[PDB]
Amino acid sequence: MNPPPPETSNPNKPKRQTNQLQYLLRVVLKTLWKHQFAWPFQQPVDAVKLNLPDYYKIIKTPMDMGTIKKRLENNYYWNAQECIQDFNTMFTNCYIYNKPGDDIVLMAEALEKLFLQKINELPT
């Protein structure tokens, strides 16, 4: 029931190092990563482990912070907006699959609040 995880390396994809990407790794991702509610999001959803064969029938663009962290560390992105889009995919997937007030949604909402806080002053 688990698809192959999102790629974290792609040799023919063009890459750039920017100050915004460095901040997304050093500040934004590490602050989220340490948060008490981060653990569900530190790796792809394991639908076999969870016995949720429906998960990847609903969520067609999966994304997790373990993938985003590996992408940042491997210099996968062209620009910060591509990374921010991955974070937003992750949050949105959580809101789509689950229902308002679910524990997992409270977790995602807390992380997203912190995320928007940290990106409120991206560098230049």
Ligand X SMILES: CC(C)N1c2cc(Nc3nccc(-c4cncc5ccccc45)n3)ccc2N(C)C(=O)[C@H]1C
Q: Which of 9, 10, 13, 50 binds ligand X (CB under 6 A)?
A: 50
Q: How far is CA 31 from CA 1, 28, 53, 106, 109, in A?
A: 31, 5, 31, 18, 15
Q: Which is nearer to ligand X, 43 or 74 (CB)?
A: 43
For position 98 contacting ligand X by CB under 6 A, the verdict is yes
- The DSSP secondary structure of 69-88, one letter per residue, reads HHHHHHT--SSHHHHHHHHH
Radius of gyration of the chain (CA): 14
Among the residue ranges 17-25, 37-45, 70-78, 116-124, the one whose residues contact ligand X (CB under 6 A): 37-45
Half-sphere exposure of 118 (CA within 13 A, CB side): 21
Q: Phi, psi at residue 11, to the nearest 5°?
A: -55, -35
For position 45 contacting ligand X by CB under 6 A, the verdict is yes
For position 5 contacting ligand X by CB under 6 A, the verdict is no
Q: Which is nearer to ligand X, 22 or 58 (CB)?
A: 58
Q: Which of 97, 111, 112, 115 binds ligand X (CB under 6 A)?
A: 97
Half-sphere exposure of 64 (CA within 13 A, CB side): 16
Residue of minimal CB distance from ligand X?
40
Give least dist CB 59 to ligand X, A. Answer: 8
DSSP 3: P
Chain contacts with ligand X (rule: CB under 6 A):
40-41, 45, 50, 52, 55, 94, 97-98, 103-104
